[PDB]
Amino acid sequence: SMEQVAMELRLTELTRLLRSVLDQLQDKDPARIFAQPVSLKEVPDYLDHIKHPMDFATMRKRLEAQGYKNLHEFEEDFDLIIDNCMKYNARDTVFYRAAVRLRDQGGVVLRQARREVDSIG
């Protein structure tokens, strides 16, 4: 149906915007602390601590299968990256502080992305 097609065109355009939102968020992580999943080989206890791991590569996989239906879903995954890190790592660590900075800076990008997704529909 043409209705199905138009919905698919909207999903695709959301996907394009989210790809750019993701590149912008990831630039706020020059150290690449959040680029890849936490290794279970190097933090064998990780899953006893953190129930839903998230990282930018996993987000990128989901994005390229057009797996985000809306901005809310994508923000949930970004927030897990931050929130997971701030729970697992202590306040005085380079990791925790990289999460604080990503959150603060990412907040700017997401404030406008939310307007663009509303605005462009």
Side-chain angles (χ1 to χ4, degrees), residues 34 36 46 56 66 68 75 81 85 94 100 104 108 115:
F34 309 106
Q36 296 297 325
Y46 190 66
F56 285 129
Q66 304 192 339
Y68 295 110
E75 292 172 305
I81 295 171
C85 184
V94 67
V100 170
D104 286 351
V108 176
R115 302 185 63 82

Side-chain angles (χ1 to χ4, degrees), residues 29-40:
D29 177 28
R32 297 188 75 85
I33 291 163
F34 309 106
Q36 296 297 325
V38 165
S39 183
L40 298 176

Side-chain angles (χ1 to χ4, degrees), residues 81-93:
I81 295 171
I82 294 313
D83 286 343
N84 286 353
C85 184
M86 291 171 82
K87 286 168 186 94
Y88 191 83
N89 303 103
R91 206 154 41 246
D92 67 327
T93 62

Side-chain angles (χ1 to χ4, degrees), residues 17 20-26 28 71 74-75 78 102-110 112-116:
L17 184 154
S20 165
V21 175
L22 179 61
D23 294 350
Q24 286 177 75
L25 288 170
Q26 188 147 26
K28 313 309 172 132
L71 181 54
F74 176 106
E75 292 172 305
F78 178 63
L102 180 59
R103 186 197 62 179
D104 286 351
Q105 295 192 300
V108 176
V109 172
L110 293 174
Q112 191 60 32
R114 152 60 56 211
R115 302 185 63 82
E116 284 164 312

Side-chain angles (χ1 to χ4, degrees), residues 17-40 42-60 62-67:
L17 184 154
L18 292 181
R19 192 173 305 131
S20 165
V21 175
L22 179 61
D23 294 350
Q24 286 177 75
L25 288 170
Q26 188 147 26
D27 295 324
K28 313 309 172 132
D29 177 28
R32 297 188 75 85
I33 291 163
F34 309 106
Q36 296 297 325
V38 165
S39 183
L40 298 176
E42 303 147 355
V43 191
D45 80 342
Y46 190 66
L47 299 183
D48 299 328
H49 297 261
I50 296 297
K51 291 308 166 192
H52 304 96
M54 196 39 62
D55 66 272
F56 285 129
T58 299
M59 292 191 64
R60 200 177 293 282
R62 185 164 163 186
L63 189 61
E64 293 311 328
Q66 304 192 339

